[PDB]
Amino acid sequence: AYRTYAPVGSHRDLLAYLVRRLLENGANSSFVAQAADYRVPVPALLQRPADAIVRPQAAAHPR
Amino acid sequence: MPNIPPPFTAPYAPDDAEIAARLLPASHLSPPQEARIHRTATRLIEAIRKRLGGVEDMLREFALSTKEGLALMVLAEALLRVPDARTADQFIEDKLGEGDFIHHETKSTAFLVNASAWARVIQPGETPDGTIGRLVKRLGAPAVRTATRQAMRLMGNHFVLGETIEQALERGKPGQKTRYSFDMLGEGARTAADARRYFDAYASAIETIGKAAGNHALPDRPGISVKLSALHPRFEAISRARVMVELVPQLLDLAQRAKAHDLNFTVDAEEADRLELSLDVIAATLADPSLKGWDGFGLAIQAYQKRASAVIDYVDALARAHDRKLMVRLVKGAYWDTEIKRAQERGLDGYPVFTRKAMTDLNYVACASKLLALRPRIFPQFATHNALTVATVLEMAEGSSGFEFQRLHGMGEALYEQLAKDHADIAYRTYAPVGSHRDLLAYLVRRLLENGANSSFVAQAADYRVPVPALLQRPADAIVRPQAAAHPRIPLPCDLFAPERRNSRGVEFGARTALDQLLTDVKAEIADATPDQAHAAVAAARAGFAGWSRTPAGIRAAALEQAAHLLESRSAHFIALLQREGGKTLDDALSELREAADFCRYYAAQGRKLFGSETAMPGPTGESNALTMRGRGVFVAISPWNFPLAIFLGQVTAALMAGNSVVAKPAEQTPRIAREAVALLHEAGIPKSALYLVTGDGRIGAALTAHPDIAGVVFTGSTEVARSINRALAAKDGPIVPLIAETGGINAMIADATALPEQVADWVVTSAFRSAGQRCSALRLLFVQEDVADRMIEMVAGAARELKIGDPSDVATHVGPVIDVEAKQRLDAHIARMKTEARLHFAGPAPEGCFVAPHIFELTEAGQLTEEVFGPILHVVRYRPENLERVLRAIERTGYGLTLGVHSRIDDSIEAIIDRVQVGNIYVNRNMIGAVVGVQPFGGNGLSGTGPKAGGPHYLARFATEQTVTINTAAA
Amino acid sequence: KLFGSETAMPGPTGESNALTMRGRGVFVAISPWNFPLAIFLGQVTAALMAGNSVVAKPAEQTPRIAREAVALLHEAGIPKSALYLVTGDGRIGAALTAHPDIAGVVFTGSTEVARSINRALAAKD
Amino acid sequence: IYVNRNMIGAVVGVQPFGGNGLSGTGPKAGGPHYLARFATEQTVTINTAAAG
Ligand SMILES: Cc1cc2nc3c(=O)[nH]c(=O)nc-3n(C[C@H](O)[C@H](O)[C@H](O)COP(=O)(O)OP(=O)(O)OC[C@H]3O[C@@H](n4cnc5c(N)ncnc54)[C@H](O)[C@@H]3O)c2cc1C
Ligand SMILES: Cc1cc2nc3c(=O)[nH]c(=O)nc-3n(C[C@H](O)[C@H](O)[C@H](O)COP(=O)(O)OP(=O)(O)OC[C@H]3O[C@@H](n4cnc5c(N)ncnc54)[C@H](O)[C@@H]3O)c2cc1C
């Protein structure tokens, strides 16, 4: 099963919603953006999260 | 009425800065000129960025390498020629991307030369290998199918193709006129039969295009593009005499057929080393009276060449002298990467082309300016898909008449549509690629490099990350200053190894002044020892060892570098010797002279690193530990007849550099070059007490190697003699001394169906028959996939028939004599045997004298070749793709392991072959010969040699011995 | 340092040239009694590190230490197929070094035996 | 060569140990030229021009 949601509302509420929505479809880390970028190989999209962290002390972002 | 111009001979590679010094000021344009250009160009680009586009869009859309684009277009063409479209659709959905990745790639490429080859059950879980498998792993199978369908629309819309020229021509048919001129696919005939085929294709194209030319006058009639390399199988400067006599009547015949339909007839421009020869051919053809009263004859001129402006002058003078009107095509140039690589390999003193893109763009505009001023006698054709270039040429014409633009079908469409909307009197010619499947691969490769190139205008305009203003930067603003004309990150060939060492100088045979001077300089240019004299030589070398070993490494290195300088200073003398005593052709002699000097400079540089200072070892406090390398003693150097200067000097200078004294015994056939080399080393700084020459037979060689006082042997030659040397050394009761032995090989090459047959054929001919096959690295055994075997074999045979066999001092000679009568007898005996044992594909005609001509035999199996045969004799085995393991085993079985060639588009196949074999030198997609010092460390294993590799970083240490000095420093 | 990566050679644009170092084949390692562990292991791990498989013949006086060392190497990650211990006399040592399929010999011991080994190697075709 | 200390107990990677003449062939055990002797060189040359 999957549920599909449609955004529903008035024009006066669109801008606030569009802003929040666009940050994600534009983000480089976003899966959706990457899967649409054919420079990114399928195997790279399948890296396990644990293999990217490797070690507890690396949990926080270094920068 | 004016004089026919002298043969074209502009300087090949002048300095970029001097050219930029004239081009930069002259490119200046007033503000209103720049404003018109800016507006026109902005409008063209806006139109470009508005359909279903080109190759560039496909490469960008799927982020494809050029190799991947190539594989898909090849697969696309094969799928377009399946009789039933539903069959293709079924294949695409159900087979493609599911598996059989390499099979699909191999078959679709084989289809291009052998249509019957292309017409299973795919097991699941197949590892994705090959170009298509790797593509599938990266993008997924559905995207690959989608990319293949797009390649199919590109192949179907932008190329006019068939199995034969008749099928292509029928397909490209419009009582209408063709809206396209024909860019014919063919180039580089490898055989006489290819040259006739291309001739007939051009002739057929001209009738088809004539029957549909419409009723207007030039320039509003179709054109055909022609390549001189397609019309003659040895189209090269050294074969000029035969080219002038053979090619001209063919080119004339086609020009006449074209004139009869009042067509535009254009001779394409090819590599820089063919410029002069082509201008010779073109001039002699144009001179014929049968071409009067026709304004369509012409040629392409490449602005990326420094010589372009001079070519324009030459062409104008040609036109005035014969009172003709010419249509002249200005292009930038399609061979840039090739010109860079060739100038580097050939050790030229510069590049014939500019190395900054903006310099080409500058020179193009300057040349367009020049061409426009030669109207109306010259009708300029500006072939470019650059919107800025178009806008700039348009401004400078100040009108729209007396010239045209040109483009290739599938490129520049939106640009030129928009140009025509904004300027209704503008003419542009559109060319369609037309030809046979067997000529597609060579053309696709050249085409794809451009649509893939990052600097390419077309690629950039299709990349929306690149702002319109960036596409409109003026070329002069990118260069700024003359001294910035050359590309900062591309060294001149003489600096290719800087700062490690200098590169030897070569000569461009395609520059007649350079070749004539070399031929002139060259034309202007021994008792055995008793066994007692050999023993006295060892003893004298033993005495000189103490002082030579203690001479500082920098001093020893300086002598090698001075020897290199003297060799290059006296190259003509040494080349003459190599030709007369060695029997070598001019290119082989020059190459050997370069290699000799490269050995000196390389061992000198490695010598300083290795012997120049001690290595400090880590250790406890209060103690020092230093490792040094000292000369061993007296080395005996035994050298062969086939590289009687370079291998002679390589072995000798290595031993000397390590701090050994040397007794050198050259091959019996070549003592004169050995004696000159030794005198040169002495003159360069090698003391008489450190180097002695002893000449004579194997008895003399055995006297040297049996001597109890020698510290090592360096040997290049026969396998049997190496073992006898090894046994004589092992028999002594003294020290076990090093033996460095380089011996022969039965060198193989593997070619699959993804390899371009014309290219393989070139590389096979070179590798097997160059130097009459008297190189240790020479191809002896070709393995070729059965699907392309007939075509590959026929092409190698046809190419081998074009080789001139004869006197090595004649410039036109390709194959000189074998070294002596005994060599010829052994070769002729192997030939007689193979004739009764194996299929004969080619047996060339030898001149009277000590000559053996190229022979080609096909063996039922590799095991029929049991000996190294040191001559121009190729053996071929055809194999089935699934039986590659049998091929690899066959190669392993000989026990040799010197060189191996691999020809394939498929990286997984190449890598699998490299992983499997233990061969010393592997050459992928090029010839198997001419190892370059310090670039290809050369040497084999198994029956082929002991190591270490000559011309590599492990060689010098073998000639030396280690010493550790440990000092208790605690008292300090 | 040596086998971990290929060495890129200078050369022309449009061409790559890489130098690698590969195992030769089967090495015969012959070791003395006086350093029956360290010289035994020095010679063996050197050959193995270079990517050769090894047949090791220790001195007749000291096989127990050799067998323990070989067993330790196996446990450390050397596959059984890459390393074998053969014990015995000089005659067994001579059988190993006369074998036509071996790719090299590393030997520590007497001068006379080295020469006999060297002659046996040179005698092969 | 050992200066002002004993002549024995060569340390691996500190005193690369081995002789010449009747004493040995080289290269020295425990030194930087040893491993190469156990190996064979291979040169791989690839014409990369078709790629760019
Ligand atoms: C129907 C629906 C309803 C939703 N309702 C809500 C809601 O009520 N409240 C709400 O907050 N979200 C909500 N979301 C989630 C939000 O809208 C995004 O869609 C979601 O976070 C994307 O995750 P993913 O698995 O699609 O994509 P991915 O590309 O896998 O994941 C992206 C997410 O990773 C996280 N992230 C990115 N960078 C970093 C970083 N450097 N460090 C740590 N985390 C990082 C962010 O949460 C980001 O959204 C909803 C989504 C859907 C589809
Ligand atoms: C109909 C037609 C016929 C042609 N016939 C021929 C022919 O007979 N012979 C031939 O050689 N060419 C020929 N060409 C040219 C070649 O095919 C390319 O199409 C052309 O060079 C592209 O130039 P441009 O103005 O389209 O593109 P751009 O993107 O403006 O220019 C690219 C060009 O710049 C040059 N270049 C790239 N990098 C550098 C650099 N670092 N330093 C210096 N220069 C650089 C190259 O020549 C390259 O092709 C022909 C082109 C057409 C359309």
UniProtKB/TrEMBL annotation, chain A:
It comes from the Bacteria. FAD binds at residue 31. Oxidizes proline to glutamate for use as a carbon and nitrogen source. In the N-terminal section; belongs to the proline dehydrogenase family. This is Bifunctional protein PutA. It comes from Bradyrhizobium diazoefficiens (strain JCM 10833 / BCRC 13528 / IAM 13628 / NBRC 14792 / USDA 110). The gene is putA.
